[PDB]
């Protein structure tokens, strides 16, 4: 039947439009903005605006949440479409708002809400429809209670809108728009896609899947930092698919009373048995299911045994899926890790700046932002926060903006005005102040992402870049050639050379090029992990790296292992041995199936333990040569962009007097010159503020900040204090080591 289309999300945000593939308009003779009648569940019929959208496939129909509710259908359902361009312009329509949103508004909806929303929008509407209108603070909803012409009519300038009357009580069938959907979650696209993949069949077609006779997954573990919306995600999925979602909290159950708490759990389970395929969500498992070492009393053992027996007996039964929320799987008792139990594992990472941007966009939908808001800037400045952090930031930013106008708003003694509310706008100063009175919670936590440093950010080392690309990109690009040749690619690549050459920058650049996750491990962290907590931390680090495959893991200050091992201390031998042995025993366990790469870097290749220098382990060795002249000029240009710019003294000349200088030293020189330029700017503003004391307000022409004109004075200061950070003895030692390797191998 060429009229059944699978429902899909609409990129268009209009509540009265539909997006179709081009052959749909070709076959169905549809014009732009055509009113087409639709069919679906509950025998719900309405019309919308036909819009061309080739993005959706022929069977795919793009159509948003509000019209989905109007049709009483869920995602993945097939609908029927029929053209009906015989609509007529509305003349007089009586509409009313639903009661349970109007609470405390005291305003005219017609001008504040209806007039701008329905400004000759030509929206095809029908009697008994439900729709939502955004507001400065709330998202109200209205229902068409009386139409002329009936039942279908079109928004026209001659539309006598009867907008005043008794608020409409809830239709007693809910279908409220207050629920949470996929659109309400930001920064979890991959995980959301995975869940939507492996939840579909057990919940949508239980009869068909049961008739197939395949055991579905039953145990899913969402784990991550607290306050990241995991419960929100579960509730949104349950609302989207439609089930008998039941929530259980840890403390509310474990500290119930005596020993009857188990019954409650049993109660929960039996209810699912009477309530179709349903979702069972349980929160804070570690609070009730810790490791047996932490278990000091006896009752907890009984609780854990009872829950294990209850959940393991869930074979067949019904199409009921159970998932749990926790923070660290390490804190969880391993006995709840077998097959048939929780086996599916999903982690929710900390969102990047972009994810923060979508979260802010979601949370600021109602707010009337002024024309000074740079959401991207805030997202950049808010690294280390979470969704709850951003929600609180938005809430108290709006609160600050409102409180700044206590004088403006009549304090009065009843429900506040709506027009005054609509007049409020949010300034960027409010957001800045909210940032000032704020603090994140994640902070000291490892972040996994794709770095931003590109190739051109570092000059020179063209052969090095080519070698790295050859070693990394092609084996994963063309595994077929390796299979034909029967070859295993190398994985352990080590860097050795003078310190300060931006080796970390090279790692970031190559990770960015490969477009994969990046994980950084520092020598400080390693030495912290020396005494005591070493094995578990290394194991979980590699587990996380394998989880985020493909990814690049980095190591720094490796020689520091020997520094406390052999040196003025000579006492960290046990911890160093533990760390080195853990690293060696775990890294070789990596399988070629995992697309994870390992990079090591050090500046003291002599002291490195020879055991690492073994095939399968770190074998590829790349020296780090110093930039020379044109390479130095390229690095200076790369560091020169920033913001200031002044081509008044030959930069190549200054590069040529600074031969044999490390890149870090050159960057230091550039920053010193920048500080001198800031000193000059401070001199300018100081003379301004001094001489307009002499002449009262002596600011008639605009005396701007000095244009970047960094003079040879600053560079002469830089060369006056010029540090050859690289030491010639160490350079000779590096060359000796390189030649020893070249002659030996």
């Amino acid at each position: 039947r060429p009229n059944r289309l699978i429902v899909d999300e609409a990129i268009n945000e209009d509540n009265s439009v539909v997006s179709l593939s081009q052959p749909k308009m070709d076959e169905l003779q549809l014009f732009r903005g055509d009113t087409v009648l639709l069919k679906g569940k509950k025998r719900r019929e309405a019309v919308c605006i036909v819009l061309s959208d080739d993005t959706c496939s022929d069977e795919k129909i793009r159509m948003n949440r509000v019209v989905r509710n109007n049709l009483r259908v869920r995602l993945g359902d097939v609908i029927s479409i029929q053209p009906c361009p015989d609509v007529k312009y509305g003349k007089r329509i009586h509409v009313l708002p639903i009661d349970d949103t109007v609470e405390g508004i005291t305003g005219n909806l017609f001008e504040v809400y209806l007039k701008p929303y329905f400004l000759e929008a030509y929206r095809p509407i029908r009697k008994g429809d439900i729709f939502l209108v955004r507001g400065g603070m709330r998202a109200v909803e209205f229902k068409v209670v009386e139409t002329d012409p009936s039942p279908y009519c079109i928004v026209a300038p001659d539309t006598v809108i009867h907008c005043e009357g008794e608020p409409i009580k809830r239709e007693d069938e809910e279908e409220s728009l207050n629920e949470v959907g996929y659109d309400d979650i930001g920064g979890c696209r991959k995980q959301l896609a995975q869940i939507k993949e492996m939840v579909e069949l057990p919940l949508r077609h239980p009869a068909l899947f049961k008739a197939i006779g395949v055991k579905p997954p039953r145990g899913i573990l969402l784990y991550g930092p607290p306050g990241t919306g995991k419960t929100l995600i579960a509730r949104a999925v349950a609302n989207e698919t439609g089930a008998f979602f039941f929530l259980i909290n840890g403390p509310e159950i474990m500290s119930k009373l005596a020993g009857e708490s188990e019954s409650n759990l049993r109660k929960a389970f039996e209810e699912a048995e009477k309530n179709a395929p349903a979702i069972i969500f349980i929160d804070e498992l570690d609070a009730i299911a810790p490791k047996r070492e932490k278990t000091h009393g006896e009752v907890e053992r009984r609780i854990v045994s009872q829950l294990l027996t209850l959940m393991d007996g869930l074979k067949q039964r019904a199409h009921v899926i159970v998932m749990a929320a926790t923070n660290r799987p390490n804190s969880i008792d391993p006995a709840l890790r077998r097959f048939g139990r929780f086996d599916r594992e999903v982690d929710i990472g900390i969102p990047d700046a972009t994810g923060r941007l979508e979260i802010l966009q979601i949370h600021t939908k109602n707010m009337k932002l002024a024309d000074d808001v740079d959401l991207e800037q805030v997202a950049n400045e808010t690294h280390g926060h979470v969704g709850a952090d951003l929600a609180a930031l938005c809430s108290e930013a709006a609160l600050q903006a409102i409180r700044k106008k206590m004088d403006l708003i009549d304090l009065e003694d009843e429900t506040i005005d709506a027009e005054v509310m609509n007049s409020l706008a949010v300034t960027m100063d409010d957001f800045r102040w909210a940032l000032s009175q704020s603090n994140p919670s994640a902070l000291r936590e490892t972040v996994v992402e794709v770095p931003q440093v590109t190739w051109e950010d570092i000059g020179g080392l063209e052969d090095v870049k080519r070698e790295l690309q050859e070693l990394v990109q092609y084996p994963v690009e063309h595994p077929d050639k390796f299979l034909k040749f029967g070859m295993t690619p190398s994985k352990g690549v080590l860097f050795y050379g003078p310190p300060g050459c931006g080796k970390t920058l090279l790692a970031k650049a190559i990770a960015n090029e490969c477009q994969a996750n990046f994980i950084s491990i520092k020598g400080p962290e390693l030495l912290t992990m020396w005494f005591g907590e070493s094995e578990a931390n290394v194991r979980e680090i590699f587990d996380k790296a394998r989880q985020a495959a493909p990814c690049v893991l980095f190591f720094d200050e490796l020689d520091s292992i020997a520094k406390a091992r052999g040196g003025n201390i000579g006492d960290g031998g046990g911890a160093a041995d533990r760390v080195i042995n853990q690293i060696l025993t775990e890294m070789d366990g990596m399988s070629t199936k995992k697309n994870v790469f390992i990079i090591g870097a050090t500046n003291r290749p002599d002291i490195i333990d020879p055991a690492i220098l073994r095939p399968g382990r770190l074998d590829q060795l790349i020296y780090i040569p110093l930039p020379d002249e044109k390479s130095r000029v390229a690095i200076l240009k790369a560091n020169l962009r920033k913001s200031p710019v002044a081509k008044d003294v030959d930069l190549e000349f200054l590069a040529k007097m600074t031969n044999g200088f490390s890149g870090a030293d050159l960057t230091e020189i550039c920053q010193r010159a920048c500080k001198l330029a800031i000193r000059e700017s401070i001199e300018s503003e100081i003379r301004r503020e001094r001489e307009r004391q002499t002449n009262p307000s002596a600011m008639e022409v605009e005396e701007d900040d000095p244009v970047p004109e960094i003079r040879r004075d600053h560079f002469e200061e830089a060369m006056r204090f010029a540090r050859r950070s690289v030491s010639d003895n160490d350079i000779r030692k590096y060359e000796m080591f390189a030649q020893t390797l070249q002659q030996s191998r």
Binding site: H94, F118, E146, V155, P157, T159, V160, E164
Partner: protein
């Protein structure tokens, strides 16, 4: 403390006043204007002489005092509750048909009262209206706080049993069933069962008393441009 006052003061005016009159008629009967011994509907006396002062007097009153108040109060409670329930749907803008059904029930029950020698025609009205209510919307699933098999056209035999254990004169619930089923047949089954010419013809004065209302358009504002 008297939450009875709070519950009564939240009642809609039309239903509160109609139900207040409905429950005040038994109070007038209980006061003693006409003795309960003077309410028996003698067949031969009504046949020969007028005695038109007590054909319906005992129907709208029940001899309830401080000995059996529980049953009377729960019956009136469910009476008002079902009144509002039927006010919700259908009779949301058409009270004329609602009053037509009430007076139809009363005419049928008083015809039966004239015909036969029953005495207390108050519970019979309960079966009449309750069955016509439960059968106007048959084939639906509803449950109370502990509903086991609470279902349409099944409460009549429930009250059959409850009146058998507590009460008598079984014919009353039979007549309530008969009137409810006759009305239900007249609603849906009759038009395509026995041809046509439906007998739902409201007399002019009955419609004059309580006609069906109409939704007002109210004030409107042109959208303009």
């Amino acid at each position: 403390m008297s939450d009875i006052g709070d519950w009564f003061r939240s009642i809609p005016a039309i239903t509160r006043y109609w139900f207040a009159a409905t429950v005040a008629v038994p109070l007038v009967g209980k006061l003693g204007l006409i003795s309960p011994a003077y309410l028996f509907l003698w067949p031969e006396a009504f046949l020969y002489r007028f005695q038109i002062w007590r054909p319906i007097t005992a129907t709208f009153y029940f001899p309830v005092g401080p000995g059996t108040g529980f049953l009377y109060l729960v019956n009136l409670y469910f009476l008002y509750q079902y009144s509002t329930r039927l006010e919700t749907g259908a009779f949301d803008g058409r009270p004329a048909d609602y009053l037509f059904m009430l007076l139809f029930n009363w005419i049928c029950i008083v015809i039966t009262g004239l015909a036969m020698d029953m005495q207390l025609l108050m519970i019979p009205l309960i079966m009449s209206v309750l069955y016509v209510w439960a059968q106007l919307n048959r084939d639906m699933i509803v449950s109370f706080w502990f509903g086991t098999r609470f279902k349409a056209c099944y409460l009549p035999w429930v009250i059959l049993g409850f009146n058998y254990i507590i009460g008598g004169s079984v014919i009353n619930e039979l007549i309530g069933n008969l009137v409810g089923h006759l009305y239900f047949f007249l609603m849906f089954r009759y038009p395509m069962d026995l041809g046509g010419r439906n007998f739902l013809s409201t007399p002019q004065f009955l419609y004059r008393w309580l006609p069906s209302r109409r939704h007002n358009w109210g004030q409107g504002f042109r959208l303009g441009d």
